[PDB]
């Protein structure tokens, strides 16, 4: 049951389940009501009539409390749990929800379901590293130029696919409650259909962190003053549910993510790949450059070919180019006295034992060159013939040639009878 491989036995692009990555997670918030106990008011409509009712937020009474576990908790339409900000946070104040995924995600959407009216202006930023730096994702506002300094709804082009846009969509009250904002990461982007083959778009959807910031409140309702406060305590942010939908980013080389030894989240790497995102080749499979799966080719890494004289190799782009873009692997630290690109021949001073297959611990046999009779210790790889001295013969140069006999000199071991 491995989806990363065929009916048999070849590999194929596999992707982790579509999930809500914000579910178990804890969200850090800039504002929350109940400390100290505070008043908040909700305005409702019947025909054209406003009815303003006021309640108390008691950060410590688990019934009138609104902690930010109520962003990521179970969403039940019946008993609804909402995080809620301080009563009056207004422009130029803003409230920030910030959520860390823990792994690189390819994010299909970000969605907030509000228990208050939606914001007039709201910004969404992401982080493709782990919270060290932030870049904008989406902007929502009535007046985009004057607020976020970005143009209003704009044509995204094949030049800039990565431009965060700003739309007046979902900036509308109403609903006064249960309002929904859904940001699709691939919405309005030209190359979306080709996403599989579009790297810029694969990048755009990648985030380790999501941070939403509510910039401005809709002013809604009639100030009736014995105290202005009643209308003031009624403008705040509340959201019942936060969802960042998407898939764990494995680059198509893994069907699931699992908890590491450190309880880190990582891909369960297949297709001979390594790395947390399966972004690199497994240690011995360097024979060709790493590549993400295209749903046509799985682009698995393939092991170096060493003759079982080495388990280390490195890739060479030139040797790859010359191979007809087949095999660029070269081998390191060839043992068993072998040497070569693939450890396919013998080191100086050795020769091939053809009694033994090319992959054998003893495949390379040392040529014993006679100390007195030979002119050097380096012999011929194929034959094993040593560089015999003058008048000397033999494979090892251990005997005198025909018409010769041994002298008492080491320099000239053989002379003629």
């Amino acid at each position: 049951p491995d989806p990363c491989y065929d009916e048999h036995g070849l590999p194929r692009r596999c992707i982790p389940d579509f999930v809500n990555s914000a579910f178990g997670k804890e969200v850090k918030v800039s504002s929350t009501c109940g400390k100290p106990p505070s008043r908040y008011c909700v305005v409702t409509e019947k025909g054209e009539e406003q009815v303003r009712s006021c309640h108390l937020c008691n950060a410590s009474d688990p019934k009138r409390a609104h902690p930010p576990s109520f962003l990521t908790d179970l969403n039940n339409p019946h008993n609804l749990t909402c995080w809620q900000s301080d009563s009056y946070v207004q422009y130029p104040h803003n409230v920030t929800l910030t959520l860390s995924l823990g792994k690189k995600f390819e994010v299909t959407y970000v969605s907030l379901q509000f228990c208050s009216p939606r914001p007039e202006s709201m910004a969404i930023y992401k982080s493709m590293d782990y919270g060290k730096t932030w870049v904008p994702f989406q902007f929502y506002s009535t007046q985009c130029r004057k607020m976020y300094n970005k143009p209003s709804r704009a044509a995204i082009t094949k030049q800039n696919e990565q431009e965060a846009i700003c739309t007046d969509s979902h900036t509308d009250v109403r609903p006064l409650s249960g309002g929904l904002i859904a940001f699709s990461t691939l919405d309005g982007r030209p190359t979306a259909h080709d996403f599989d083959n579009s790297p810029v778009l694969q990048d755009w959807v990648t985030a380790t962190d999501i941070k939403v910031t509510f910039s401005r409140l809709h002013t809604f309702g009639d100030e009736n003053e014995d105290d202005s406060e009643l209308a003031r305590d009624s403008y705040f942010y509340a959201v019942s549910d936060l969802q960042v939908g998407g898939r764990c980013k494995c680059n198509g080389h893994a069907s699931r993510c699992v908890r590491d030894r450190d309880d880190n989240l990582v891909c369960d790497c297949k297709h001979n790949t390594a790395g947390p995102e399966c972004d690199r080749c497994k240690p011995f499979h360097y024979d060709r450059p790493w590549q993400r799966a295209t749903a046509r080719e799985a682009n698995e890494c393939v092991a170096c070919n060493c003759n079982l004289h080495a388990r280390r190799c490195r890739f060479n782009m030139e040797l790859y180019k010359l191979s007809g873009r087949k095999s660029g692997g070269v081998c390191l630290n060839c043992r068993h006295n072998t040497a070569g690109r693939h450890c396919h021949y013998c080191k100086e001073g050795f020769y091939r034992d053809l009694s033994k297959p090319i992959s054998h611990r003893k495949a390379c046999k040392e040529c014993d060159c006679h100390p007195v009779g030979a002119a050097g210790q380096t012999c011929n790889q194929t034959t094993g013939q040593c560089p015999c001295k003058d008048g000397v013969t033999g494979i090892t140069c251990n005997r005198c040639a025909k018409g010769y006999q041994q002298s008492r000199s080491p320099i000239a071991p053989c002379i003629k009878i």
């Binding site: 579509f18 299909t108 919405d187």
Partner: protein, 205 residues
Amino acid sequence: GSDETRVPEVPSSLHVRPLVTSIVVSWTPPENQNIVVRGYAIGYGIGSPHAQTIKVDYKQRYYTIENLDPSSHYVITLKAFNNVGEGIPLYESAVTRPHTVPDPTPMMPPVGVQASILSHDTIRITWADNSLPKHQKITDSRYYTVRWKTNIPANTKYKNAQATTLSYLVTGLKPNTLYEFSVMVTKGRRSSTWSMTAHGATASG
């Protein structure tokens, strides 16, 4: 057993099959059967499943979402529910795609293509069809596509025109140049490959 004290757990499996304008969603009930499930709620949408929600009873193991935009990416969420509320969802996303119609068996290409050289300007080529009675007159709707290119060099972009008859006149041409001709038949949704190539050269005038 049966327990309504709490919301049902998450479903055991969810699976989605995308079609042209429709999507078939199939699933299996939550593992613990002690928790009562009254039904299943299926949310769906483009880019996110907040567009529309459809509820079915506890007996349904599949549903076909209809009236969906073509070549679109749908996110689908499947929950089980009872009188307490809705449970933890499963997500799956699928993309609607044009159905791929299996290729029809190929027709046999025209045969006996011949080039008759009138002038420097034009060459007339004719052929035969063994898919036709020997009198060679057309009844069912056929059309022949005729392509020609310059033989020198080994490549040139082909020029082609059509015919409702078994003869055709190639008109604009280069004087004193060898030309490569060929023709295919297409009838209804079936077509044939290109015929054997016939060569001919203009009058050099």
